[PDB]
Scaffold this active site. Structure first.
Site, PDB file in Angstrom:
ATOM      1  N   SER A 242       0.832  -1.091  -0.070  1.00  0.00           N
ATOM      2  CA  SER A 242      -0.116   0.007  -0.249  1.00  0.00           C
ATOM      3  C   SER A 242       1.058   1.282  -0.034  1.00  0.00           C
ATOM      4  O   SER A 242       1.938   1.231  -0.804  1.00  0.00           O
ATOM      5  CB  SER A 242      -1.100  -0.306   1.046  1.00  0.00           C
ATOM      6  OG  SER A 242      -1.780  -1.394   0.790  1.00  0.00           O
TER       7      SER A 242
ATOM      8  N   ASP B   1      -7.797  -2.489  -8.124  1.00  0.00           N
ATOM      9  CA  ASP B   1      -7.268  -2.071  -6.701  1.00  0.00           C
ATOM     10  C   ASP B   1      -8.378  -1.353  -6.192  1.00  0.00           C
ATOM     11  O   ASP B   1      -8.803  -0.328  -6.588  1.00  0.00           O
ATOM     12  CB  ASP B   1      -6.164  -1.455  -6.629  1.00  0.00           C
ATOM     13  CG  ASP B   1      -5.370  -1.173  -5.179  1.00  0.00           C
ATOM     14  OD1 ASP B   1      -4.805  -2.069  -4.670  1.00  0.00           O
ATOM     15  OD2 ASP B   1      -5.661  -0.323  -4.835  1.00  0.00           O
TER      16      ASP B   1
ATOM     17  N   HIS C 135      -6.857  -5.425  -2.007  1.00  0.00           N
ATOM     18  CA  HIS C 135      -5.884  -4.420  -1.833  1.00  0.00           C
ATOM     19  C   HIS C 135      -4.885  -5.189  -0.841  1.00  0.00           C
ATOM     20  O   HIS C 135      -5.444  -5.716  -0.045  1.00  0.00           O
ATOM     21  CB  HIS C 135      -6.440  -3.208  -1.185  1.00  0.00           C
ATOM     22  CG  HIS C 135      -5.625  -2.157  -1.161  1.00  0.00           C
ATOM     23  ND1 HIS C 135      -4.613  -1.514  -2.038  1.00  0.00           N
ATOM     24  CD2 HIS C 135      -5.189  -1.202   0.134  1.00  0.00           C
ATOM     25  CE1 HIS C 135      -3.848  -0.539  -1.641  1.00  0.00           C
ATOM     26  NE2 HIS C 135      -4.302  -0.304  -0.584  1.00  0.00           N
TER      27      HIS C 135
END
Ligand SMILES: c1ccn(-c2ccc(N3CCOCC3)cc2)c1
Ligand SMILES: *[C@@H]1O[C@H](CO)[C@@H](O)[C@H](O)[C@H]1NC(C)=O
Length: 352
Positions: free
Chosen positions: A145, A253, A298
């Site tokens: 991330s 995503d 994600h």
């Protein structure tokens, strides 16, 4: 379990001035080192950093950190859960600087918060060289991330740091998971007035000034003053990098869809979503080490079930092993794996 060590250099701090640190599990029979950067958004002015301190304080402070953390996914030491690097030395670096790992500013009479993400990485590497990193053969800087974007921003600086300290033989590499974002057209639009309405391009432009943010040198020289925000977007910073970098990115995503203001799908949104997958696939066409499945999700690499997803029949742990072999094409051992089907979950191995 990985054990917590707070930085001996107490000038390198989390947002509130408490010491930064790292969690470590040594493997004294191994010369491989995995340094993982945690993710979790960012804050870019006084008001939204203040809110983050109220209800996301572990991402701004070490005061409440536990003494140990259990390694999961690529940080697991069990081969059953981690087929790739189970015998490596494992490091987890908590994200407590709220700056996408780019900041170099201390708390002071003029700064309520410290943003020291780029300096935290540098100091962790320095202190680990006394705990065995001096004898490494490979240092893999990984992250998920905002931590995946942090890999892209910091991998060449770690390589430069180790050369100048006299360790030119350690091979520095990067693994960026779920940190490859597009500065694309949003599905619905809001002017930048507050945290939730501010698109990443505008938010990062302001953040760089608030954090005293730093970007890789070659990318900085291309875009120049006032345009360094461009280097936070993978398809623009990756071609400037000298270190080998493996890119993991879901084609649809969830964080990308959120910044695009996307939450029975009619034609307009169907075409928007298919075009997003097409553009992401296009930006990876010339990335030789990459894994990009057609799923809505994600993060992946610290999930315990990261072994389950496959592209063209190859899992992510296998593709990383094939990458290792290639840095010594391989029959049956591919390194570039990008789905071509055009809708979330057209790959049957997608997470549930
Ligand atoms: C360029 C550089 C970083 N990014 C970036 C990072 C994180 C996010 N997410 C954080 C959580 O919720 C919003 C989405 C979005 C974009 C874009
Ligand atoms: C401590 O960290 C600061 C910030 O990067 C650095 O300037 C200083 O040289 C460090 N001190 C030592 C002894 O490493």
């Amino acid at each position: 379990d990985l054990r917590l060590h707070l930085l001996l250099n107490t000038s390198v701090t989390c947002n509130d001035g408490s010491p930064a640190g790292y969690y470590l599990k040594e493997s004294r029979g191994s010369r491989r080192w995995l340094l993982f950067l945690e993710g979790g958004w960012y804050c870019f002015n006084r008001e939204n950093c203040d809110s983050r301190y109220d209800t996301m304080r572990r991402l701004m402070s070490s005061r409440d950190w536990p003494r140990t953390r259990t390694g999961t996914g690529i940080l697991s030491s069990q081969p059953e859960e981690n087929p790739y690097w189970w015998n490596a030395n494992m490091v987890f670096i908590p994200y407590c600087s709220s700056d996408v790992w780019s900041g170099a500013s201390s708390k002071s009479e003029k700064n309520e918060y410290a943003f020291m993400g780029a300096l935290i990485i540098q100091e962790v590497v320095r202190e680990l060289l006394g705990r065995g990193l001096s004898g490494a053969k490979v240092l893999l800087l990984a992250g998920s991330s905002a931590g995946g974007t942090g890999v892209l921003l910091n991998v060449d600086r770690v390589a430069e740091q180790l050369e100048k300290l006299g360790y030119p033989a350690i091979q520095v590499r990067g693994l960026a998971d779920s940190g490859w974002f597009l500065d694309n057209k949003q599905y619905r639009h809001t002017d930048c007035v507050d945290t939730i309405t501010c698109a990443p391009t505008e938010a990062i432009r302001r953040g760089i000034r608030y954090w005293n943010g730093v970007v890789p040198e070659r990318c900085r020289r291309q875009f120049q003053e006032g345009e360094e925000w461009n280097c936070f977007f993978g398809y623009k910073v990756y071609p400037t990098l000298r270190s080998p970098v493996f890119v993991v990115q879901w084609l649809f995503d969830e964080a990308q869809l959120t910044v695009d203001n996307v939450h029975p799908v009619q034609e307009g949104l169907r075409l928007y979503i298919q075009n997003l997958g097409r553009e992401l696939r296009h930006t990876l066409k010339d990335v030789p080490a990459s894994f990009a499945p057609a799923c809505l999700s994600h993060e992946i690499i610290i999930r315990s079930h990261w072994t389950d997803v496959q592209v063209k029949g190859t899992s992510l742990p296998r593709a990383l092993h094939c990458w290792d072999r290639s840095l010594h094409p391989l029959k049956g051992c591919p390194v570039h794996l990008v789905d071509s089907c055009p809708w979330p979950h057209c790959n049957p191995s997608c997470p549930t």
